[PDB]
From a paper:
We next attempted X-ray crystallographic analysis of the complex of rat VDR LBD (residues 116–423, Δ165–211) with several of the lithocholic acid amide derivatives. According to the method reported in our previous study, a synthetic peptide containing the target sequence of the coactivator MED1 (mediator of RNA polymerase II transcription subunit 1, also known as ARC205 or DRIP205) was included in the crystallization solution of VDR LBD and the test compound. However, the analysis was successful only for the complex of compound 7b. The electron density map clearly shows the VDR LBD, the coactivator peptide, the ligand and a relatively low number of water molecules. Figure 5a shows the overall structure of the VDR LBD complex with 7b; it is similar to those previously reported for VDR LBD complexes with other lithocholic acid derivatives. The hydroxyl group in the 3-substituent of 7b forms direct hydrogen bonds with two histidine residues, His301 (O···N distance: 2.79 Å) and His393 (O···N distance: 2.68 Å). The direct interactions of the hydroxy group in the 3-substituent with two histidines may contribute to the potent activity of 7b and 3. The carboxyl group of compound 3 (Dcha-20) formed hydrogen bonds with the phenolic hydroxyl group of Tyr143 (O··O distance: 2.81 Å) in helix 1 and the hydroxymethyl group of Ser274 (O··O distance: 3.13 Å) in helices 4/5, whereas the amide group of 7b did not form a hydrogen bond with any amino acid residue. Instead, the terminal carboxyl group of 7b formed hydrogen bonds with Arg270 (O···N distance: 2.82 Å) and the backbone amide bond of Tyr143 (O···N distance: 2.91 Å). Among the synthesized amide derivatives, compounds 4a, 6 with an N-cyano group and 7b with an N-2-carboxyethyl group showed the most potent activity.
Numbering used by the authors:
A (entry chain A): 123 to 145, 152 to 157, 219 to 420
B (entry chain C): 626 to 635
Amino acid sequence: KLSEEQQHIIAILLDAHHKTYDPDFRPPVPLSMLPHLADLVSYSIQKVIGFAKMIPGFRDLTSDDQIVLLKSSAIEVIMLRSNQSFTMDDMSWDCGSQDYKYDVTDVSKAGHTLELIEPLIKFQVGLKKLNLHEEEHVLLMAICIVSPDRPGVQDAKLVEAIQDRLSNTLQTYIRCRHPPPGSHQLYAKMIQKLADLRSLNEEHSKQYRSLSFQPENSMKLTPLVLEVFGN
Amino acid sequence: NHPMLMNLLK
Ligand SMILES: C[C@H](CCC(=O)NCCC(=O)O)[C@H]1CC[C@H]2[C@@H]3CC[C@@H]4C[C@H](CC(C)(C)O)CC[C@]4(C)[C@H]3CC[C@]12C
């Protein structure tokens, strides 16, 4: 049954998410969309950082550990948070108006291939099929970020203790608040989605390394994108 | 080596 502490965490994560997710950039136009979507991702990294800072216990981590968690989770959290604006009606990210509505055609014009885009879209469909509560969605984003198995973490035990608190809150939430049979193996399906994001992260990194090796494309990126994803 | 990330954290 959900403790005071557990309800507190959920309340904090929902508010952090509402404050940092809104359903200025170079305008949308094989690379025609790279400037706009580099800007969109660069901006979305700032939102991820805004959310991460409000995760209970995140602030207790060293600056270095905060940096390695954010560097390694940022693209995964961007893909994961986008799910709320994703519409199975026409497999698009429909951010209000048609200018800022993104289908397979649009997101494939930024020098990334269907090797990334097709799994990304299947991931969004698979996540919609789970029909998560916003409570489960914000817990999954927090567990995604505060992960003790990211390369470069110094205090794995502290990150593990924070993640376990978040994991325990999530499992408790599912048992008390998620309607069976929708609750059945829901925790395990959500962890599987975190695994699908690690694989999407790896494919993004491979493709980013090639794209960003081409200086004519690097030129279209942003300083934050270069610092987070690399040179 | 991460000044902009560091700034956004603080
Ligand atoms: C429009 C969607 C967000 C919609 C939302 O989340 N809006 C809310 C905001 C907010 O208000 O905070 C985002 C979500 C995942 C995004 C994709 C991730 C993979 C990939 C990264 C690449 C970045 C470089 C640096 C070029 O490697 C650029 C193309 C690329 C395919 C992205 C396209 C746009 C995507 C689909």
